[PDB]
Every structure is written in structure tokens, then in C-alpha cells.
Write an enzyme that holds these catalytic residues in place. Structure first.
Site, PDB file in Angstrom:
ATOM      1  N   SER A  91       1.006  -1.029  -0.101  1.00  0.00           N
ATOM      2  CA  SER A  91      -0.078   0.037  -0.072  1.00  0.00           C
ATOM      3  C   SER A  91       0.915   1.090  -0.025  1.00  0.00           C
ATOM      4  O   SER A  91       1.860   1.274   0.817  1.00  0.00           O
ATOM      5  CB  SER A  91      -0.769   0.259   1.061  1.00  0.00           C
ATOM      6  OG  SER A  91      -2.176   0.694   0.704  1.00  0.00           O
ATOM      7  N   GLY A  92       0.557   2.373  -0.800  1.00  0.00           N
ATOM      8  CA  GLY A  92       1.136   3.254  -1.150  1.00  0.00           C
ATOM      9  C   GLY A  92       1.654   3.263  -2.446  1.00  0.00           C
ATOM     10  O   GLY A  92       2.289   4.233  -3.087  1.00  0.00           O
ATOM     11  N   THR A 121      -3.623  -0.107  -6.354  1.00  0.00           N
ATOM     12  CA  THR A 121      -4.928  -0.123  -6.521  1.00  0.00           C
ATOM     13  C   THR A 121      -5.525   0.926  -7.503  1.00  0.00           C
ATOM     14  O   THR A 121      -6.414   0.815  -8.251  1.00  0.00           O
ATOM     15  CB  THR A 121      -5.539   0.474  -4.958  1.00  0.00           C
ATOM     16  OG1 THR A 121      -5.188  -0.545  -4.035  1.00  0.00           O
ATOM     17  CG2 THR A 121      -7.210   0.395  -5.153  1.00  0.00           C
ATOM     18  N   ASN A 168       3.975  -2.716   6.762  1.00  0.00           N
ATOM     19  CA  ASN A 168       3.254  -1.733   5.959  1.00  0.00           C
ATOM     20  C   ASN A 168       2.047  -1.455   6.711  1.00  0.00           C
ATOM     21  O   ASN A 168       1.389  -2.482   7.586  1.00  0.00           O
ATOM     22  CB  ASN A 168       2.890  -2.424   4.763  1.00  0.00           C
ATOM     23  CG  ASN A 168       2.232  -1.342   3.609  1.00  0.00           C
ATOM     24  OD1 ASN A 168       0.663  -1.180   3.646  1.00  0.00           O
ATOM     25  ND2 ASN A 168       2.678  -0.632   2.614  1.00  0.00           N
ATOM     26  N   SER A 184      -1.457  -4.074   4.640  1.00  0.00           N
ATOM     27  CA  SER A 184      -1.010  -5.115   3.848  1.00  0.00           C
ATOM     28  C   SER A 184      -2.142  -5.986   3.864  1.00  0.00           C
ATOM     29  O   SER A 184      -2.938  -6.450   4.526  1.00  0.00           O
ATOM     30  CB  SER A 184       0.136  -5.827   4.891  1.00  0.00           C
ATOM     31  OG  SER A 184       0.547  -6.926   4.502  1.00  0.00           O
ATOM     32  N   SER A 185      -2.072  -6.746   2.582  1.00  0.00           N
ATOM     33  CA  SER A 185      -3.102  -7.573   2.061  1.00  0.00           C
ATOM     34  C   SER A 185      -2.715  -8.891   2.747  1.00  0.00           C
ATOM     35  O   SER A 185      -1.628  -9.321   2.463  1.00  0.00           O
ATOM     36  CB  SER A 185      -3.037  -7.727   0.601  1.00  0.00           C
ATOM     37  OG  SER A 185      -3.288  -6.469   0.028  1.00  0.00           O
ATOM     38  N   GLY A 215       2.509  -9.909  -1.073  1.00  0.00           N
ATOM     39  CA  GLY A 215       3.972  -9.944  -1.625  1.00  0.00           C
ATOM     40  C   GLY A 215       4.856 -10.471  -0.779  1.00  0.00           C
ATOM     41  O   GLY A 215       4.682 -10.853   0.596  1.00  0.00           O
ATOM     42  N   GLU A 225       7.759 -11.371   1.665  1.00  0.00           N
ATOM     43  CA  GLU A 225       7.859 -10.725   2.936  1.00  0.00           C
ATOM     44  C   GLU A 225       8.870 -11.286   4.024  1.00  0.00           C
ATOM     45  O   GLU A 225       8.936 -12.606   3.916  1.00  0.00           O
ATOM     46  CB  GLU A 225       6.602 -10.280   3.629  1.00  0.00           C
ATOM     47  CG  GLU A 225       6.219 -11.376   4.612  1.00  0.00           C
ATOM     48  CD  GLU A 225       4.653 -10.977   5.179  1.00  0.00           C
ATOM     49  OE1 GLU A 225       3.869 -12.075   6.005  1.00  0.00           O
ATOM     50  OE2 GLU A 225       3.843 -10.182   4.371  1.00  0.00           O
TER      51      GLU A 225
END
Ligand SMILES: [Mg+2]
Ligand SMILES: [Mg+2]
Length: 726
Positions: A154-155, A159, A201, A204-205, A425, A427
Site C-alpha cells: 500500500s502506497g 489499487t 506496511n 498489508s493484504s 507480496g 515478505e
């Protein structure tokens, strides 16, 4: 004298391997360079390790594979040259790299859409629209489904680029504004329940998702669907220090109304066990209250009834109450009702009879012989069954949200899809557990999929150009690590975990000992460290990761007590009942099967690869940091692509273009020579170029890394010289 100078990219501190400076080569031997650092010290480097700097003609190329010195700092440098011109998109072989500019840029207008229509990749600048259009035309021309695999924390812009893909496809294939908004409003809902703050993050997904943009046989957009994979249910019941639970919990407590708060009997987050151990309940720059509003609105947009919305938050609240249930061993083997406030609060929101629930938690009955037996459980086992109840409830809820979202999206008349894949991702945390191994395994397989796809395209390119050079399947480079994790014979880590899990007397220590006995000093991708007794290391495409084995045997089991299932089947809530009435395998085997099903899906598609990255960790425009950029490029597989690309003949020049540039390096070669191949050969032979460094193709000259740069350096020198070299 300008053209005598040669530069190199070097690390001022080798252990900070992604922090570079520019140094100047001063001397050269058979096997090495000597160079001068920015402050003046001389250093040596072997030619096999040296990162030469590309001549200035190569700065700003639209595809990193056009670089002649194809190396990691040179890749960063090219990305930076483009970024400093507000060119945020750049190809790297098959990849599209997208760097977040952290500011508004007007490149997604209707005038820009039109430029990309029907244009192949080589006719327009790099752009997400270009990727999208090629996918769309391929789908129709080949009558084959497509996938877009997009990375980015994210960032990074993942998206925003997914939204641009969807907007583009709707613009080139729509007749469909309501569908498009429905698709887009899925993401805030799933993110609330599937994303969480980790140490790396804030958003995070912790799940994978495949969004199908569906088309009819004529090529018009016809629907969409969403599929989820591999949600990390362990986070619901435990978070490491400074991390958070799933967003939805903090969103509910911060943005709920006072009546809702009373109705669902909720206090602040640190009032709840499941949200109060990590020491973190808020994220700087994020308002959980506003995010909750955003979640609610999305649910309205996609068709959630107000009745459903309230039952969803009842389950979220129920899980929190269930977590504050404190079991106490009323002295004896078993556990007791300590205090019934948490249970009834949970039972109230769940619509369940509270007395049924407490009995199913501590005194579950399972058939002994062939009749019932009330198993009184101790505090430990009572807590775990309570935890397994929560995890089953959250995961069933997640699957129901997906099903409800899919219900509103149309799926009639589908012929094809263009699918966007979004997965956790690669990690590396300070401490890595089973969750990280599973995530990194998924990424190893996805990178192998890229590498193998690159291989098939390179085999065809060399065949078409009639190039005398053979190379083996790039996907084989990944197989040792994949086998070490998921292999069957010899058994890999997950197989050995499974073998140990079946014994109730296995321990952390028996498991790690078995792993070391099978792999230590026997498998080049595995490491038993010299001083830890509970960790092992796996060498992934993205680097070595050290995994801590504590609790893995428990993590590999997910039993749920039938009496708990029976209890929740009776509930008043319409949603809760669905979780349990719509319809032995270890967690590792489940993970492997779910990944194998995703891969099978991907194998039916033509894939496209987009890599979204942040230039720095301060959300600042116009500021690149090589350390930040290169970590992402390593994790998302771009540096793996570079590794492969730089090994063969990456630079491939149409003969006439070669001659137009380099005719002046040979006597009596005209710039517009009629026989471009003969003129190319004349230039190469005059320069005494080693023929092993190039291959003549049907339409292009193919060069090994570095060779085209040297020819360019000779041109730079020839232009400023008074006569040809001696
Ligand atoms: Mg994101
Ligand atoms: Mg980006």
C-alpha cells in the site's frame, strides 16, 4: 578529454548492497577494473562483478532490456532518469514497472485513452493503458483468457493501476457505468476484512484475490466476478508487537454510532483481548472512523441490505466478545464459567443461546466408541477451541462477503475474462513464521511462472530470428527452492511438517531436528544456522529468509468441534446461519491445494505483469531512494528477470538502425548502406569485435551484455577525435 572516461556504479559499503555511488575507472587488467571512489580512494573489482555505467545514449530507454550494462544500479539509474522527467512507467522485459509519483499527473485522460487503442507495445510509450489494450486485443484475437499480475504494497499505486485497467477496459469494451462502480467498490470491503497493519506496511493484504473482468464472445464487457484465496486467519486471534488485527475491528469501534455501540455492547479497542496485546491500536495518518464510513458506503453501493450490514458487524463484535472470554480451571481437570459477561455479549450479538455455547466450548461431546461422551477440556484446550471458533467464523464470513459481492455482479453470457491477481507480496519480518513461509512459497511459484513464461517467449524469439544459441528452461532455476518447500520425494518442509503433525507427542524440537536431518548440508537452498536451535533458512529468488519453528505443529491443525458447529446452526441471525449451513486436511495441505488451483487457473491464461513501487518511504514527490526501490524490485521479481535477461543476448538491433548509428566506425561504410547486414558485419570486423559476443539474426543483430555499450563508447570517441584510432 571527455570520451576517455568510464564510470562504474559501486557500493560505498558492500553490506549496504542497494546503496550506490558513481566512481571513475582508471586502470584495466585482464580480469579486473581499478576505479576511484567519490572521495578519492582507489578500489579494484573483478570484471565479472563490475557494474559499469551505461553511455548516456542509453539513459531513458523505455525497456530496461535495451540497456547494454544490464545490472542492478544501472536499472535503478534508468528508472530514475525517467522518473525525473515524470515518466513513471518503464518496461523491464515483460514487466511494466510503475513508480508512484506521490502527486497528481494528468496521464489518464480521455485523450490519452485514445492513443493506446489498438497499439502494440512497441508503438507507444510504456503505460498501464498499453498493457490493458494488448491484453484485450490478445483475448479476442487468440480467444484466450488473460491475467494481469499486479504487485505493490500500500502506497505503491497497485489499487490505482487496477482502477485504471478497469476504467480502460470499460472504455474500450463498454456499450456499463454501474458494473464498473460495483467492481471498484468491492475493494474497500475486502480490504477492511483482509488487510492489516504489519511492521512493514500499514495496509498489508493478507489474502489473494482474482478479479475477473468478463466479456461476451463479441468482446463487450459482460460482468465480473471475484475469487479469494488463502486468507490468514491466525491474525484474528494473535498479533505480534506493534502490528494490528484486521482493519474492520478498529473501524467498527471508532466509527460506530452511540446506539450501535450500545446495541452491540462495545467499548474501546484496548478493552478487548484480540486488539489489546500488540500495543498498537491506531495508524498515524489513518482515521479508522472515516475508513468505516467508506466501508459502509461501499457496502451500500454493492447491494448489501441494512439488515445484512448489521449482522456483519454483529459477527465482528461477537468475535471480540468471544475473545474476552477468560477460562479458569475450576480446580480439577476442567475449565469453568469464570464470569458470564463476555459469553452472553457474544451470544446476544450472534443470536445464539448462551448456555449452549459455553457447553460446546469446554465440554464438547465427540463419539467415544460409537456413543456420545462429554469431554471436559482444560483451560488450554478450551481457549484453543474458542480461538478455532473465531477463526472459522471470520473465514466463513470472508467467503460469504465474496459470495454476496459476486451475487450482485452479473456473470451471464461470459465467454472470456481478463483477470487481475493481487496476492500478498514476498515478505521478510524480524521473525518469520509459518504464515511467511506459505506467503513466500506462493511468491516463489509465481516467480517461476513468470520465468517460465519468459522462457517460452524467448524460445520463440530466437527461433524466429534463426539465432544459433540454446538455453534451458528458466523456470528450472526456481525448482530447488519449490521442491524444498512442497516436494514429495524427497519430502519437503511441508511434507515433513505433516508427517510430524500426526504424532501428538511431536514437538517444536522434534520438528526442527527432522528438518535439519533431512536438509542441513544436504540441500544448497537450506541453512541450519550456527547459533539458533529453532530457526532454519530458505534461499528464495528474493533472498534468504530465516524461519522460526515455534508453534508450527499447532498452526498446521485446524479442527473445529462439531458441537460448536451445531450450536451456531440454531442462531437467530440470518447471516450466521448461512455461515454454518451452506457447505482432517492439514493447513499445509490446504495451502498447497489452494495454490495449485490458482496456478491451474493462471496456466489457462496469457499473463501480463505489472510491478507498482514506491520511490521512498516518506510519501514525497521527486525523491528516489535506491535502497527502497531495489528492495521492492528484488521482492517483486524484477531483479530476477534482470538476472536472466543479462545472461544471453539481450540487445537486439534492426540492422539498418545499427548501420545508421555506427557506419562511421568503419571506412567506406555508408550510413544508408543498401545491404544492412553486410555493413553491420563490416563495422564489427573492422572493430575486431569478438564474434562470440554477437549473433546475426534474420532481421536483427543480437548482442551479449556490454558489447553494444563498448561500440557506443567507440562512437563517442570517434566523433571527438581528429583521426581514426591506432
Ligand atoms: Mg494497496
Ligand atoms: Mg506505482
Amino acid at each position: 578529454t571527455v570520451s576517455d572516461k568510464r564510470y562504474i556504479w559501486y557500493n560505498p559499503d558492500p553490506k549496504e548492497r542497494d546503496s550506490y555511488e558513481c566512481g571513475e575507472i582508471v586502470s584495466e587488467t585482464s580480469d579486473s577494473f581499478t576505479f576511484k571512489t567519490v572521495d578519492g580512494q582507489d578500489r579494484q573489482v573483478k570484471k565479472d562483478d563490475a557494474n559499469q555505467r551505461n553511455p548516456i545514449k542509453f539513459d531513458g530507454v523505455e525497456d530496461m532490456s535495451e540497456l547494454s550494462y544490464l545490472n542492478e544500479p544501472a536499472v535503478f539509474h534508468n528508472l530514475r532518469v525517467r522518473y525525473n522527467q515524470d515518466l513513471i512507467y518503464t518496461y523491464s522485459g515483460l514487466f511494466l514497472v510503475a513508480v508512484n509519483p506521490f502527486k497528481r499527473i494528468p496521464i489518464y485522460t480521455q485523450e490519452m485513452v485514445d492513443i493506446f487503442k489498438g497499439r502494440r507495445r512497441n508503438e507507444v510509450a510504456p503505460h498501464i493503458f498499453a498493457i490493458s489494450d494488448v491484453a484485450y486485443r490478445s483475448m479476442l484475437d487468440d480467444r484466450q483468457n488473460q491475467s494481469l499480475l499486479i504487485t505493490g504494497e500500500s502506497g505503491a499505486g497497485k489499487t490505482e493501476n487496477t482502477k485504471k485497467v478497469i476504467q480502460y477496459l470499460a472504455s474500450v469494451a463498454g456499450r456499463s457505468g454501474v458494473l464498473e462502480q460495483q467492481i471498484l467498490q468491492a475493494n474497500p470491503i475486502l480490504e477492511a476484512f483482509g488487510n492489516a497493519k504489519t511492521t512493514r506496511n500499514n495496509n498489508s493484504s493478507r489474502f489473494g484475490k482474482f478479479i475477473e473482468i468478463q466479456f461476451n464472445s463479441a468482446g463487450f464487457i459482460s460482468g465480473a466476478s471475484i475469487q479469494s484465496y488463502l486468507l490468514e486467519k491466525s491474525r484474528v486471534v494473535f498479533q505480534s508487537e506493534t502490528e494490528r488485527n484486521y482493519h474492520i475491528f478498529y473501524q467498527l469501534l471508532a466509527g460506530a454510532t452511540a446506539e450501535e455501540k450500545k446495541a452491540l455492547h462495545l467499548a474501546g479497542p484496548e478493552s478487548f483481548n484480540y486488539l489489546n496485546q500488540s500495543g498498537c491500536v491506531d495508524i498515524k495518518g489513518v482515521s479508522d472512523s472515516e475508513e468505516f464510513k467508506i466501508t459502509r458506503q461501499a457496502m451500500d453501493i454493492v447491494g448489501f441490505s441494512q439488515e445484512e450490514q448489521m449482522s456483519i458487524f454483529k459477527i465482528i463484535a461477537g468475535i471480540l466478545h468471544l475473545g474476552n472470554i477468560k477460562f479458569e480451571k475450576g480446580a480439577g481437570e476442567g475449565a469453568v464459567l469464570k464470569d458470564k459477561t463476555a459469553l452472553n455479549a457474544a451470544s446476544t450479538v450472534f443470536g445464539v443461546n448462551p448456555s449452549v455455547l459455553e457447553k460446546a466450548l469446554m465440554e464438547p461431546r465427540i463419539l467415544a466408541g460409537r456413543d456420545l461422551v462429554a469431554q471436559h477440556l482444560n483451560v488450554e484446550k478450551s481457549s484453543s477451541s474458542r480461538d478455532a471458533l473465531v477463526k472459522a467464523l471470520y473465514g466463513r464470513l470472508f467467503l460469504w462477503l465474496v459470495k454476496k459481492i459476486n451475487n450482485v455482479l452479473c456473470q451471464e453470457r461470459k465467454a472470456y475474462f481478463i483477470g487481475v491477481l493481487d496476492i500478498s507480496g514476498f515478505e521478510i519480518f524480524k521473525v518469520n513464521s509459518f504464515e511467511q513461509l506459505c506467503i513466500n512459497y506462493t511468491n516463489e511459484k509465481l516467480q517461476q511462472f513468470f520465468n517460465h513464461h519468459m522462457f517460452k517467449l524467448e524460445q520463440e524469439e530466437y527461433l524466429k530470428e534463426k539465432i544459433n544459441w540454446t538455453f534451458i528452461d528458466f523456470g528450472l532455476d526456481s525448482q530447488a527452492t519449490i521442491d524444498l518447500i512442497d516436494g514429495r520425494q524427497p519430502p519437503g518442509i511441508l511434507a515433513l511438517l505433516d508427517e510430524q503433525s500426526v504424532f501428538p507427542n511431536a514437538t517444536d524440537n522434534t520438528l526442527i531436528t527432522k528438518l535439519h536431518s533431512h536438509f542441513s548440508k544436504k540441500n544448497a537452498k537450506y541453512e541450519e544456522p550456527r547459533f539458533s536451535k529453532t530457526e532454519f533458512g530458505v534461499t528464495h529468488y528474493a533472498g534468504q529468509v530465516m524461519y522460526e519453528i515455534q508453534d508450527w505443529l499447532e498452526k498446521n491443525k485446524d479442527p473445529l468441534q462439531q458441537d460448536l458447529e451445531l450450536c451456531f446452526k440454531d442462531s437467530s441471525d440470518n447471516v450466521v446461519t448461512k455461515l454454518f449451513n451452506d457447505p482432517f486436511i492439514t493447513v499445509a495441505a490446504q495451502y498447497k491445494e489452494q495454490l495449485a488451483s490458482l496456478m491451474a487457473t493462471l496456466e489457462t491464461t496469457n499473463p501480463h505483469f505489472v510491478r507498482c513501487i514506491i520511490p521512498n518511504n516518506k510519501q514525497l514527490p521527486a525523491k528516489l531512494e535506491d535502497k527502497v526501490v531495489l528492495d521492492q524490485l528484488r521482492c517483486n521479481g524484477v531483479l530476477e528477470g534482470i538476472r536472466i535477461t543479462r545472461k544471453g543476448f539481450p540487445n537486439r538491433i534492426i540492422y539498418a538502425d545499427f548501420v545508421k548509428r555506427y557506419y562511421l566506425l568503419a571506412p567506406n561504410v555508408p550510413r544508408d548502406a543498401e545491404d544492412s547486414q553486410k555493413a553491420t558485419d563490416a563495422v564489427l570486423k573492422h572493430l575486431n569485435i569478438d564474434p562470440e559476443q554477437y549473433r546475426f539474426g534474420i532481421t536483427k543483430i543480437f548482442f551479449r551484455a556490454g558489447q553494444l555499450a563498448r561500440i557506443e563508447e567507440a562512437r563517442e570517441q570517434r566523433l571527438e577525435s581528429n583521426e581514426p584510432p591506432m
